[PDB]
Design a protein around this ligand. Structure first.
Ligand SMILES: [Mg+2]
Lengths: 212, 250, 233, 244, 240, 222, 231, 235
């Protein structure tokens, strides 16, 4: 697994791989690791697949109840804390989660919260979670600027997952991109890593170690 | 089923009276006379053994009861209510004191616990007040000899000497004339017997009178020897013969 | 969680053209000690069902009491208790299977393997298995413990699939069952010579045979066997 | 069923009054008068025992004045048995606060807690209220010397001088007349005894019919001392102030 | 537990226990709320039947629920403490979970919900209390003023009064308060609030309390002398 | 120590077509090296044009299917006989599975049917309730033997058009119900040859707008 | 009078007035008919509307594939009792793989209603039910009263003006019991029976509600244009 | 006294019948269902001019496809709305779909008779629940404290209900447009209200398949009031 999310001028980019494994056996290449909590909030899936799926669609239900009662969009701070407080109640029972709760509101602007099954809740600009997280951090750290364009930011997220998919055995399949704006998230397609690798190698001149 | 009486059965009336407590006191007034007198070196408590039938063995009915080795109690009013209070009083002396401090409670604190139980039956759900007034006599190291009265309301007062029940008004007047701060225990027993004779109609002897004292330590009633600090109970119930001996010098 | 103490070994069974047959030996073992020699492990329910039980005997006696209570309960306010609303094999099995799975789910199992054999109202043969884990399955032949490894192979040579059931008579079926019980006596160290056998037929009803013995045993060839290799005397 | 016998102790009258609270206050008006007076250098608590006897053991008796902790004391007016239930609860609350914060409980916090307990009995549970009114005399380092009162409704208020029990109307008028802000403890002692002497239903005010207590910073240097007066000490202060 | 249904319907469709709780509010001392353009003022009556009172320590009529919201009331004093405590706990609970202080409307909705619950729960009687809740939402400069009552209904008010003789001061406010142009300053708002209480109070001495709440957690209680200056200026203009 | 779980073997396969869906599974039930049954049905019609199979530990599998069938029944009672759509059934099964998150149903569940546009649908679940809509999904013992074959022959992975040499992919043309069944049979025949727990028989349930049909085929019994 | 304040009080003549008042709620309810042959069992129910803008209140509830009832009285009480029947039918199927007998279903309803007539605090159910079903002993019709009394019948009717339909069925007894293997004719007899209870109003397309269960017929409810055939 | 769950000699629950009298004292609420949508309208009825009328919330959203209007003791409605919102959201969580309007109404009505000696008394408020689903289209339900709910083509509740219902009897037909329904609610509200109807003392709302549940702005309603006045003066 490799999942990332970062803040920038134009909002938030969310990028994930698609692979799921049971030991060395590749169970699926078409897994959805971005949970669509609602039209304005996104969550990423790492650790336990069920734990992330179940509790983040539950989070969507709680967010919907909030805006019905308060007649106002829930903040990313409040939404992330509902999830972190919930998993903290289960601490010790064996839940497995590592997720980024991503959103863009009026009062906060673009906001990302890393939420963990041992109770951790961190606000930040760049987060990277999974078995291939170290590979993606390398590409992110050396190319990240606040004043990136939406086009260049989308590519940076796509390229960083590709870096992980190449080196990390347990990451790959395809890349799913998302762009989060104040008016909601926008899906930017599914990209097969097999086809993407050769395309990037030729156009970019990278991966000279690999024969193509 | 389930106890569905979770509300108070004793309530304030427009005049500010707690009816059920007043009516409980009325029951005490109908009860047989009992009294208590405090001396310099002891305390005496006494009452009449009003036998319901001559076929009944009145020795099997104890109106004067040991609560602790140094504390005793007598009553006026409803006998059955008294019997269960003695059971509760004996147990609370252990659970809320002896099992904590490794010694028996002082008179005033045991009285305080009995009072609390009687107060709760005046406020708790689905119960009536206890229909008794108690007289509790006792001794302890730091307070010395003492005598307390406890009423249905839970209120308690310390006395030099007093009486409760049927002929209490006349008995208290009799005690006021005779009581002084220089009385020895034998003098107090003598006065107790004189006072009690006035309220008794029929037979007046050791078999119709129940009398106990809180006095000197009785090592003969301890049941074992070998521990110097354990010297025996100060509570002692007088025998039928011991009472009759003092009725000749009456 | 517990361990089985006093235990019963294999229960074996099979279908035939007009009904079902079931059998089990009369032993209650205490480890390697063959302690109790008169234990009945086939328990009839009505005139259309026989429940065969292996494993822990204390738990068997508990199950036996549940089935007894089930018959009593079914008769309450039931004018057709001995007719249309009598207990079916399928009702008895489903009840037991429910209990077995519930008990394993509380981590406190009834340490048994059970085979329910019977005939339904419409004449259909019923034969199904359930164990301490709540696992269930049906087959033309069924067996527990050692029976699964040694009896099934022999019984499957008679009825190999569904279409072999109408071609199998009660005489051929009983013969196969009795032979299997002999083979188990040769080879299972926790088995006995004495056993019980029950037949449930759609025409002739329930026949319960007690105090049967393994007979026609081959032992004579043992006299010629000497040493473990080289020894001649 | 049981509904038939329920008095319904926690309901409003058509006028918006709590029946049982009002009737409990009627009960308290027949109790012995208790007075509290606050001065610059201390607080006085004075109270009248109800028609006593010569055979009552006075030196070991306590029906009016109770110690809650080293800094706070209360004067009682009403059912003594009801008061002791609440007093023990208050003593525990003070110790809970001391264990939690390692500081003595502020006077108002203790008063609010007891008053909230009284309030509960008027709103839920279907039980009769406590027939007790308290005068709280206490000291803490925030507000200094403080006087409060609470009644069966669970309402509490602060005072410079106050009375509860019998003849409060007459007593409050006498206190309102002679009280001044720059008053001292020794002057307050005299005012309290003079007020009881005039309002009492007894023929004369004697030592055996009184309980008395002072809270003074008249303790060696920056600290507070509670003094529950002995029978002989009440007899002396009665002669000193010229009442006997 | 005690489960008796004390609040029930009558043949004419009334819940008398809730209606008798309003009669307790009618008996309570008068309270008034007025919101200006950039502030809200809470005025309260103190009955002068009680002198020899210690005003330092006596419970004040206005209570802070948080640094930005206040609550006043008319009715049973002991009952109001229970609502105030619950409201204060909920305010801190909201900050802890939502990471933002309560809006005035949310805090009102909570207190009103508690009051309603006590009108259809077994073994309990309704609160004999009506409240005025005022303040400013976080990062907002629009004044807020709400009212609640024993039944549990709540609503927003430009200006409102509760308690004894509240019919009279509401009469005053209805003819003196203009919606198109509310009291533009703190002075004008306090003046109109003191004027409204002077219709009912008696003496303008220690009988009137005033509390001013401004945006961004700026809350202050006026002293005797400061209020006395408003009382003086009002009557000198009246002598004409 | 008592082990509440067991392994009953078995292998299942779900494929979604353009206007149909199949859910297949072998009929063999086992423990260790023994055969319990040569014909023990594993794929079930649950009503509302939905077919289901819960492969792994048979006791948990039977419990789950029984509870889902029940959920369909109560959905009709509570919501005016409304048809339970395949997507709604999937979400419901998640809650059934996650309800035992800390003592899981030891099964790999697959359901098949048609979506609300009439197109073929298959959903796949892990033991604790995570689920995906999928085109092709094998489960159980011989899943690792079957899936690579399906990737190659259904999705045409690693297949390119002759003459172009890797430049143009083989186009993803739609398969008929007859074509899918051929691939299912060849999948299980191959799995039977190389996996000891697979054999005896193959039962296929086909789902179309007309309803649910069954097909049975013999497999090797060794 | 003095003995009708609660269900826990007998009158001096041994009557339970709260139960009798609950029985009165059924008489105010709309008419419903039940009848059976040896192969099928039928329910016919006259639905009641609030006004011309309103819908007609549903009267028939399905409990299982082989069982269901019609109601008359407090509709929410019928929902509680029918929900209980659904659960009991379901417990029988899951645990015993057995369809619940109609007679046993009546016994369970009796016992549930009884507990509400002997305890303080509660109240009797204010609804009457007609249960039809087909089990292992053929077709069945039951009548439930909230006193607890359950009765097995060939035919019956409950609700307002139910006496007319009950007399008709008492005359027709020998005819309709013989209607075997003909569902349409059995419903006709039921529609003709409920017609003896109508005044001023007649059976329209959104007024009539019919249900049937039989040998090879699951419990199914007919409403709307599906009952125009029988008008 | 007497039980809370007691039956009268006529076979009615005393407490339920008495709560119906409280609802008669409540402000008027009207609903009209058409094939283009369902309209909901209420009388605000402010007790004083100083009360800011836009804080009077008698029309409420339950979900995007379901709305609700109330009449009677409106404080009692808050827990009913809470339950309805929870039921709607919970069903979406369990089934990944919208809940049927009838099923939502039934869930709300299950609370009604949960009173005894559970809550101490019935609810003193009636609800008009309006919504849309794919199976039964546009719907309007009337939920009472008895636990009974009726579906309606049009319905009025509150103090002016029987006069309004008689008016709805004549005016409703199966071909009404949404615009016609809006004017019809305004017309009937104006007829039964004490004070003169305007955009500040009355409120409109609707539910459509496309846009979902929407409460109308005071500016939008004001235009519809002006449109009503002109068409009544047109003959
Ligand atoms: Mg094989």
């Amino acid at each position: 697994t490799t999942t990332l999310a970062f803040r920038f001028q134009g909002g938030i980019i969310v990028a994930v791989d698609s692979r799921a494994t049971a030991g060395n056996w590749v169970a699926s290449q078409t897994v959805k690791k971005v949970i669509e909590i609602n039209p304005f909030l996104l969550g990423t899936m790492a650790g336990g697949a069920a734990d992330c799926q179940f509790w983040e669609t539950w989070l969507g239900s709680q967010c919907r109840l909030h805006e019905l009662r308060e007649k106002e969009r829930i903040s990313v701070a409040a939404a992330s804390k509902i999830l972190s407080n919930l998993v903290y109640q289960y601490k010790g029972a064996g839940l497995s989660m590592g997720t980024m709760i991503c959103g863009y509101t009026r009062k906060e602007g673009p906001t990302i919260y890393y939420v963990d099954s041992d109770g951790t809740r961190l606000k930040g600009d760049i987060f990277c979670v999974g078995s291939g997280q170290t590979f993606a951090y390398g590409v992110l750290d050396s190319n990240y600027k606040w004043d990136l364009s939406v086009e260049d930011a989308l590519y940076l997220g796509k390229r960083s997952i590709l870096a992980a998919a190449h080196r990390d055995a347990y990451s790959g399949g395809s890349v799913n991109l998302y762009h989060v704006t104040e008016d909601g998230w926008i899906y930017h397609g599914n990209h097969d890593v097999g086809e993407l690798f050769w395309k990037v190698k030729e156009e970019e001149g990278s991966f000279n170690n690999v024969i193509g | 089923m389930t106890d569905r009486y979770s509300f108070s059965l004793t309530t304030f009336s427009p005049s500010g009276k707690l009816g059920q407590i007043d009516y409980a006191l009325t029951a005490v007034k109908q009860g047989v006379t009992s009294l208590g007198i405090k001396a310099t070196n002891g305390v005496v408590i006494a009452t009449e053994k009003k036998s319901s039938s001559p076929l009944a063995m009145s020795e099997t009915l104890s109106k004067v009861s040991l609560l602790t080795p140094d504390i005793g109690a007598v009553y006026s009013g409803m006998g059955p209510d008294y019997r269960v209070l003695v059971d509760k009083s004996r147990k609370v002396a252990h659970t809320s004191y002896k099992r904590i401090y490794g010694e028996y409670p002082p008179t005033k604190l045991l009285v305080s616990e009995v009072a609390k139980i009687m107060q709760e039956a005046t406020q708790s759900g689905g119960v009536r007040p206890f229909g008794v007034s108690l007289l509790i006599a006792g001794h302890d190291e730091f307070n010395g000899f003492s005598l307390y009265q406890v009423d249905p309301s839970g209120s308690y007062f310390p006395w030099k000497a007093t009486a409760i029940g049927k002929g209490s008004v006349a008995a208290k007047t009799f005690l006021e004339k005779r009581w002084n701060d220089e009385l020895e225990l034998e003098d107090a027993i003598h006065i107790a017997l004189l006072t009690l004779k006035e309220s008794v109609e029929g037979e007046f002897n050791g078999d119709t009178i129940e009398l106990a004292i809180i006095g000197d330590e009785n090592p003969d009633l301890l049941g074992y020897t070998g521990i110097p600090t354990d010297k025996g109970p100060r509570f002692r119930k007088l025998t039928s013969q011991e009472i009759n001996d003092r009725l000749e010098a009456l | 969680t517990q361990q089985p103490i006093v235990t019963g070994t294999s229960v074996i069974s099979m279908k035939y053209d007009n009904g079902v047959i079931i059998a089990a030996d009369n032993l209650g073992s205490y480890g390697s000690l063959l302690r109790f020699n008169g234990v009945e492990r086939l328990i009839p329910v009505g005139d259309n069902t026989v429940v065969g039980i292996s494993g822990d005997i204390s738990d068997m006696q508990h199950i036996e009491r549940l089935l007894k209570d089930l018959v009593t309960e079914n008769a309450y306010d039931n004018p057709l208790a001995d007719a249309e609303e009598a207990l079916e094999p399928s009702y008895i099995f489903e009840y037991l299977a429910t209990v077995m799975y519930q008990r394993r789910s509380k981590m406190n199992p009834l340490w048994n393997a059970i085979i329910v054999a019977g005939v339904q109202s419409n004449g259909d043969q019923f034969l199904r298995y359930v164990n301490l884990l709540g696992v269930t399955y049906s087959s033309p032949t069924l067996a527990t413990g050692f029976g699964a490894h040694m009896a099934n192979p022999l019984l499957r040579k008679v009825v190999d699939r569904e279409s072999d059931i109408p071609k199998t008579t009660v005489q051929v079926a009983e013969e196969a069952i009795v032979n299997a019980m002999r083979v188990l006596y040769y080879r299972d160290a926790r088995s006995s010579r004495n056993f019980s056998l029950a037949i449930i037929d759609k025409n002739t009803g329930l026949t319960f045979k007690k105090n049967l013995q393994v007979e026609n045993m081959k032992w004579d060839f043992a006299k010629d066997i000497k040493g473990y290799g080289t020894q001649k005397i | 069923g049981s509904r038939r016998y329920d008095s319904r102790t926690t309901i409003f009258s058509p006028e918006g009054r709590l029946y049982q609270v009002e009737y409990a206050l009627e009960s308290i008006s027949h109790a012995g008068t208790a007075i509290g007076i606050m001065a610059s250098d201390g607080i006085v608590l004075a109270a009248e025992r109800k028609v006593t006897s010569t055979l009552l053991e006075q030196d070991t008796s306590t029906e009016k004045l109770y110690k809650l902790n080293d800094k706070i004391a209360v004067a009682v007016a009403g059912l003594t048995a009801d008061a002791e239930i609440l007093i023990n609860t208050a003593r525990i609350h003070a110790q809970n606060y001391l264990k939690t914060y390692n500081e003595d409980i502020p006077v108002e916090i203790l008063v609010r807690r007891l008053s909230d307990i009284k309030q509960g009995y008027t709103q839920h549970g279907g039980l009769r209220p406590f027939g007790v009114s308290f005068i709280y005399a206490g000291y803490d380092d925030r507000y200094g010397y403080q006087l409060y009162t609470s009644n069966p409704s669970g309402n509490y208020t602060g005072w410079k001088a106050i009375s509860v029990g019998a003849n409060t109307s007459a007593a409050q008028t006498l206190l309102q007349m002679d009280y001044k802000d720059d008053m001292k403890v020794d002057d307050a002692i005299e005012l309290a005894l003079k007020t009881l002497s005039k309002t009492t239903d007894s023929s004369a005010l004697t030592y055996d019919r009184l309980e008395f207590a002072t809270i003074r910073k008249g303790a060696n240097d920056g600290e507070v001392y509670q003094k529950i007066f002995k029978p002989q000490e009440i007899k002396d202060i009665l002669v000193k102030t010229g009442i006997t | 537990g005690y489960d008796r249904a004390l609040s029930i319907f009558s043949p004419d469709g009334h819940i008398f226990q809730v209606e008798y709780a309003l009669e307790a509010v009618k008996r309570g001392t008068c309270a008034v709320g007025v919101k200006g353009k950039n502030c809200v003022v809470l005025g309260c009556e103190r009955r002068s039947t009680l002198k020899l009172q210690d005003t330092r320590i006596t419970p004040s009529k206005v209570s802070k629920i948080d640094s930005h919201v206040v609550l006043s009331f008319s009715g049973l004093n002991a009952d109001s403490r229970i609502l105030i405590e619950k409201a204060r706990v909920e305010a801190q609970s909201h900050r802890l979970t939502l990471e933002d202080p309560v809006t005035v409307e949310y805090l009102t909705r909570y207190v009103a919900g508690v009051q309603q619950r006590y009108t259809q729960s077994g073994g309990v009687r309704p609160f004999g209390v009506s409240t005025l809740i005022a303040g400013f939402d976080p990062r907002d400069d629009e004044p807020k003023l709400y009212q609640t009552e024993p039944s549990g209904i709540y609503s927003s008010w430009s200006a409102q009064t509760i308690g004894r003789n509240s019919k009279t001061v509401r009469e005053f406010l209805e003819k003196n308060y203009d919606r198109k142009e509310p009291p533009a300053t703190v002075e004008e708002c306090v003046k109109l609030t003191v004027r409204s209480l002077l219709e009912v109070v008696q003496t303008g001495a220690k009988n009137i309390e005033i509390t001013v709440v401004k945006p961004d957690s700026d809350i202050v209680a006026l002293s005797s002398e400061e209020i006395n200056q408003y009382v003086t200026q009002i009557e000198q203009e009246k002598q004409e | 120590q008592f082990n509440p779980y067991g392994d009953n073997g078995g292998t299942i396969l779900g494929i979604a077509g353009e206007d149909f869906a199949v859910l297949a599974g072998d009929t063999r039930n086992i423990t260790d090296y023994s055969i319990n049954s040569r014909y023990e049905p594993k794929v079930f019609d649950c009503g509302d044009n939905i077919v289901m199979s819960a492969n792994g530990f048979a006791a948990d599998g039977d419990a789950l299917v029984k509870r889902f069938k029940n959920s369909v029944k109560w959905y009709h009672f509570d919501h005016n006989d409304k048809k339970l759509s395949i997507n709604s059934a999937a979400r419901n099964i998640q809650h059934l599975l996650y309800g035992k998150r800390f003592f899981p149903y030891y099964v790999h569940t697959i359901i098949a049917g048609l979506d609300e546009d009439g197109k073929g649908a298959v959903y796949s679940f892990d033991p604790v309730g995570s689920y995906e809509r999928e085109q092709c999904r094998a489960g159980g013992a011989a899943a690792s033997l079957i899936m690579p074959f399906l990737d190659n022959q259904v999705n045409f992975k690693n297949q390119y058009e002759p003459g172009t040499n890797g430049k143009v992919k083989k186009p993803l043309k739609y398969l008929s119900v007859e074509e899918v069944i051929k691939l299912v049979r060849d999948s299980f025949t191959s799995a039977t040859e190389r996996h000891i727990q697979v054999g005896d028989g193959l039962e296929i349930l086909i789902v179309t707008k007309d309803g649910v049909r069954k097909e049975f085929y013999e497999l090797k019994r060794d | 009078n003095n003995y009708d304040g609660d269900t826990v009080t007998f009158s001096p003549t041994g009557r339970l007035f709260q139960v009798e008042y609950a029985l009165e709620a059924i008489k105010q309810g709309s008419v419903t008919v039940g009848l059976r042959s040896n192969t099928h069992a039928v329910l016919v129910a006259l639905k009641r509307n609030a006004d011309e803008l309103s819908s007609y209140q549903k009267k028939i509830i399905k409990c299982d594939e082989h069982m269901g009832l019609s109601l008359a009285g407090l509709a929410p009480d019928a929902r509680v009792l029918s929900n209980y029947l659904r659960q009991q039918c379901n417990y029988s199927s899951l645990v015993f793989n057995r369809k619940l007998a109609v007679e046993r279903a009546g016994h369970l309803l009796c016992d549930k209603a009884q507990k509400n007539t002997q305890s303080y605090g509660g109240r009797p159910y204010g609804v009457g039910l007609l249960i039809i079903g087909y089990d292992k002993s053929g077709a069945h019709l039951l009548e439930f009263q909230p006193s607890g009394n359950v009765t097995e019948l060939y035919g019956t009717a409950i609700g307002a003006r139910s006496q007319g339909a009950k007399t008709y069925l008492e005359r027709t007894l020998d005819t309709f019991i013989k209607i075997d293997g003909n569902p349409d004719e059995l419903i006709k007899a039921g529609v003709e029976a409920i017609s003896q209870s109508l005044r001023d109003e007649s059976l329209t397309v959104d007024n009539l509600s019919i249900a049937i269960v039989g040998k090879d017929t699951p419990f199914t409810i007919y409403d709307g244009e599906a009952v125009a055939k029988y008008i | 006294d007497r039980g809370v769950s007691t039956f009268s000699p006529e076979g009615r629950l005393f407490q339920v019948e008495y709560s119906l009298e409280a609802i008669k004292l409540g402000s008027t609420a009207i609903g009209i269902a058409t094939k283009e949508g369902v309209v909901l309208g209420v009388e605000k009825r402010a007790t004083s001019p100083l009360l800011e009328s836009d804080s009077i919330e008698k029309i409420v959203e339950i979900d995007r496809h379901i709305g609700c209007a109330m009449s009677g003791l409106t404080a009692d409605a808050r827990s009913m709305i809470e339950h309805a919102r929870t039921a709607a959201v919970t069903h979406n969580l369990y089934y990944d779909e919208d809940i049927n309007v009838e099923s939502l109404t039934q869930s709300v009505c299950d609370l009604a008779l949960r009173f005894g000696e559970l809550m101490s008394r019935p609810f003193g408020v009636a609800l008009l629940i309006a919504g849309h689903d794919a199976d039964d289209g546009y719907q309007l339900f009337h939920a009472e404290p008895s636990g009974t709910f009726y579906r309606y083509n049009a319905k009025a509740i509150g103090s002016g209900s029987e006069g309004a219902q008689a008016e709805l009897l004549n005016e409703w037909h199966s071909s009404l447009t949404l615009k016609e329904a809006e004017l019809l609610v305004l017309k009937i509200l104006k007829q039964v209200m004490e004070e003169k109807l305007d955009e500040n003392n009355a409120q409109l709302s609707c539910i459509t398949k496309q846009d979902g549940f929407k409460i109308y702005d005071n500016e939008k309603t004001a235009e519809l009031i002006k449109e009503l006045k002109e068409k009544e003066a047109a003959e």
